[PDB]
Structures are given as structure tokens and as C-alpha cells.
Design a protein around this ligand. Structure first.
Ligand SMILES: [Zn+2]
Length: 275
């Protein structure tokens, strides 16, 4: 097939988009993520090796919706490589309280129906910038979208033993708003979006309140942030610590969450197991 031939190179900001894009690209392009699995993605601090990586790319993809607060500054260091957001056509859910009230929640990929839009935007970008391989990108995008569509029934079935009134999803970052909307959960979080911020101790008390009044049985944390506030809530309440949920990062390839599909599956399975 050729060990020497330089393939079209895509660099993504973080691992979820890398894996979605690699499924669309197949063996016709190579996709690499800037952030490493487990690394916090909202306020990531790029290195000089990161600049070298993106400079080597033919196309740079990012979430937008101000997810990657570092990206626009990072992109100043890149010359003559185009960049594209992958969330065009996504309906934002706003953050509802605090100093980020009204800012778009950037975690749109946790809705599998939204992931179809991610796939379409990535397909368009790949076809635009590497048109010689359009048939491969289109074939692959269609087959991957069908895989994602086929998740809806098993995911809903996996959550089907939790009656509507009990469907409370208590997490650390409020990163699950789109998933909660899709599957009919009421979200509760310890902070509305990852950031250096005040007010988490106050919110811990508020969440203990909500847990106690609704007798919610489980609370979670996520793979790139601290599990201490979540475990503070579980200690003070009848709720068990059920975490860890995956949203901002895949695991390593040898870890429990190597792919975007595995991420959606593991997050849903862990929620269901909590109940
Ligand atoms: Zn996040």
C-alpha cells in the first residue's frame, strides 16, 4: 500500500473528534489529536511540540462553540494550514446559571443524533480539502453514521429500567446536557463548565440538597477533572459514587474507552449501572 507515501494529514484539537474523523478518513488520511487522552481540554496549555504537530497538517479541525478556549491563540502560530469548526448546524443548549449563563454548552457530541452532524461537517471538510478521496470519505461517513444511528435503540433500552421521575443525572461538569435532553434525564452538576472559577463549595451544598430531597441514588465525576467534590456529595448523602463518566476525552488505546462509540456506550452503561 506504501510505507512511504505521505497521506493527507488532519490534526484535531481533542480525542473525540480525532476518532470520529479517523473513521470517516479510513486508510486515506491520518488523523491526530493535539491533546492526549485524559488531558483537560477546555483550558489546555499548548506546547511547542503541539505547534509543530499542527503545522504538519493539511487541515485542522476543532469543536468551536468556544470549547477550546486556547485554540484561536494557538492557531496564530500556524501558517498556511486551514482550520474548520465541526459544529456548524448544531442547535446550542445554553448554560442556565452563574456567570456563564447563556453561553453555549459546547458538549454537543454527547447526543448521538448530534454526532450525525459532526460526521457530516467532517465529511464536507475532508471532501473540500482532499477531493481526490471524496468517494472514500463519503462511503465511510455513511457507514459510520449508520453505526451511530444503530446505537439509539440499545442505548435507550439500556436506560429503560429507570422510571421518568427517577431520571436524575448528577455529574461534576455539566457536560451531559445534550445526552440528558436526548434520553429524558434531569441534569444536576457541580459546575456548569470547566474553568477556573468560584462557587463550587456553595454548589456542593446545593447539590447535596437536591440529592436529599429527591433521594437520588448515584453521583458521578468525569475522566479529566477532580472526583473530590462528587465524593464529598456521596459521603454526605444516601447517594453512592458511581463515576467515572467519559465526555471530554477518550482513554488510551489500552484503556476502557478507546473510541467515540465506546465513550457513548460506557457513559450510558455506567449511568444505568449506577441505578
Ligand atoms: Zn467539558
Amino acid at each position: 500500500p506504501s510505507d512511504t507515501a505521505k497521506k493527507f494529514k488532519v490534526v484535531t484539537t481533542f480525542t473525540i473528534i480525532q476518532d470520529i474523523a479517523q473513521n470517516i478518513a479510513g486508510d486515506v488520511a491520518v488523523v491526530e489529536s493535539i491533546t492526549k487522552p485524559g488531558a483537560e481540554i477546555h483550558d489546555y496549555q499548548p506546547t511547542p511540540r503541539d505547534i509543530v504537530k499542527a503545522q504538519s497538517a493539511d487541515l485542522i479541525l476543532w469543536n468551536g462553540m468556544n470549547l477550546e478556549r486556547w485554540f484561536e491563540k494557538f492557531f496564530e502560530s500556524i501558517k498556511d494550514v486551514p482550520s474548520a469548526v465541526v459544529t456548524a448546524g448544531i442547535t446550542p443548549l445554553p448554560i442556565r446559571e452563574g456567570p456563564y449563563s447563556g453561553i453555549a454548552n459546547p458538549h454537543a457530541w454527547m447526543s448521538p443524533s448530534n454526532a450525525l452532524i459532526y460526521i457530516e461537517n467532517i465529511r464536507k471538510a475532508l471532501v473540500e480539502h482532499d477531493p481526490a478521496h471524496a468517494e472514500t470519505y463519503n462511503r465511510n461517513a455513511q457507514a459510520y453514521a449508520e453505526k451511530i444511528k444503530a446505537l439509539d435503540a440499545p442505548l435507550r433500552e439500556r436506560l429503560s429500567r429507570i422510571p421518568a421521575e427517577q431520571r436524575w443525572l448528577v455529574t461534576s461538569e455539566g457536560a451531559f446536557s445534550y445526552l440528558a435532553k436526548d434520553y429524558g434525564f434531569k441534569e444536576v452538576y457541580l459546575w456548569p463548565i470547566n474553568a477556573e472559577q468560584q462557587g463550587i463549595p456553595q454548589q456542593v451544598r446545593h447539590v447535596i440538597d437536591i440529592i436529599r430531597e429527591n433521594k437520588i441514588p448515584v453521583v458521578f465525576s468525569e475522566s479529566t477533572i477532580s472526583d473530590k467534590p462528587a465524593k464529598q456529595v456521596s459521603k454526605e448523602t444516601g447517594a453512592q459514587y458511581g463515576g467515572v463518566l467519559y465526555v471530554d476525552s477518550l482513554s488510551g488505546e489500552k484503556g476502557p474507552v478507546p473510541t467515540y462509540i465506546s465513550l457513548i456506550n460506557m457513559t450510558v452503561d455506567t449511568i444505568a449501572k449506577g441505578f
